[model samples]
Target: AVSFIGSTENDVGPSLGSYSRLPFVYDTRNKIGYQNANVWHISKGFCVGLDGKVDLPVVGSLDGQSIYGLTEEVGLLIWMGDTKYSRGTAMSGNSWENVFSGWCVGANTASTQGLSVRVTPVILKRNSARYSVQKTSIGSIRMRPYNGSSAGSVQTTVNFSLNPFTLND
Candidate 1:
């Protein structure tokens, strides 16, 4: 028989684990939504956004450090534990449905009115130490320049959350 017990009290096996809404107002007085294709990133492991935010030793830091960029850029990075999944690929359809919640943003040359959202069912989950519900949605908004007018800004609040993990034990 083989035993893999911890020899020290400090030695212990780590448990397996798994992983928001807000109102946004955008001014389109003189700006137009830059018409672009839909963009997104998804994963079943670690955070992809934080990876992009990391600062490199030789290279400079990531310029845009906003969650809003999630949709603005057509890039993605998924991972499992320390292992990373493929880049610039879509999550499997079946897996996508399993996602606790998701947020989406849509826009056009129009005003904030062009921005819309369709939230899916809410899922209860944990964030850090506190327990909270995931506020998922399928819509967002942005503005640029329409007719060469003044640029506009976006203001909003977000309630983010992730689900808990289960141990096989």
Candidate 2:
């Protein structure tokens, strides 16, 4: 749980106006742009617990529904839109090395603010499936090649805004 007291005018920063149009929850640090209270919380693909405590990507969990805002996650705090990728794989049996033969690359652009990209990848044990959030970048976004199984199979999941919130200023 977190708390703060200050002028409501200073609650949010001016740069966040780009995403203000959307119904997003903003944090004090202005590092993320939450989509909703239910389902998905796009701050590095965090999970909103039943207790109303939101689990952050890497920094751990935060309490209280009030502090649920935004910040630098493994995707974008200043960028927006979708993140696409390209991949390729090698044929060497179904061994771990085979997965290593695969490689992938990702790219995107800034939408709201001008900061670096944040990338966070999570692997699911149930299906042995893998995915990531990835960090943000100022210029055209790009991800280095990584090993995997196949081009199509090697991919990452990220949250982005089709409708970017803009500031009047």
Candidate 3:
């Protein structure tokens, strides 16, 4: 939910896909080639790695003016126009199968690696047609120099606002 592990080394994944090269870690404790665990698409919003670039507000603006701070990246995967499934399928058991094709939110990038996305929800004064809204929630997102796939471990909690559009109660 917090991080992304794709088919790219940038996000901690297997860069190359080998069909018979082993999907789950082959085990004798379980089955000769079966896995003790299963893989399913985590129902999450926002995106992963170089996706949907959009400008978040600078600590919530007055009348939606003065956007600042560096641009942030985010993602979400959803199903549109299909009334069949509540979410996506994992296609049985597989470790790296996630967010099927065209399931990505905001951007339907078709190339192997050419999808530029917007991170869902068209909000803020960024829209010229919209009126001057009170502010933004840029301060909601945080960052630290603590860890990375470079090396790390820690317990955690993510505090989220149910009504995220507003900066204050």
Candidate 4:
């Protein structure tokens, strides 16, 4: 069980927005999306339970219903979509070497209030393989090679729209 206040008391940072999008959920060799079949939830946008076949997001947001009768586990993790940074592993106990091998990168831009920068989201284990949330970040959005088994030289390209949740003078 986890409670997530995606936004802070100061301003609406990229944490909530990042949580709204599950990029690393889907990572495939052919699809480049969610490679893992199941993803457990810890909070609003966290997924950190894997032993073999974990559960997916219960509702979608924090206020959603809890998923009943579905639970699985594994240690392997995959990263997808456009995110700031991530660190997970298929190998347990090797935290130092395995964590950084899987990640996605995003960009930082200016917005209404200030800079719509990403704060390196983190997936915290929730409960019984149900929900997780992006709790933290690594403070950078650099693209590094992740040893995800399904290797290949990917191209960098995408179109996105930026919005300002807050305004500053």
Highest lDDT, which number?
4
How close is every model to the real structure, measured as TM-score? 0.17, 0.17, 0.14, 0.16
Per-residue CA lDDT of model 1 for 9-67, tens digit only, reads: 11001112222121122221211111112111221221111111111111111222112
> Which residue window of length 10 is worst by lDDT in model 3?
30-39
Local accuracy by lDDT, each model: 0.18, 0.20, 0.19, 0.21
Output the worst ten-in-a-row residue range by lDDT, candidate 1. Answer: 50-59
The residue-level lDDT of candidate 4 at 169 comes to: 11
Q: Name the regions of candidate 2 deviating beyond 4 angstroms.
A: 1-149, 152-159, 162-169
Candidates 3 and 4: which is better by TM-score? 4
Tens digit of per-residue lDDT, candidate 3, span 32-71: 1111111112123323221111133332222222223222
Off by over 4 Å in 1: 1-114, 120-133, 136-140, 152-169
Tell me the tens digit of each residue's lDDT in model 2 across 82-169. Answer: 2111121111111121111211222221111111121111111111121122222122211112232121332122222212223211
Q: What is the lDDT of residue 136 in candidate 2?
A: 26
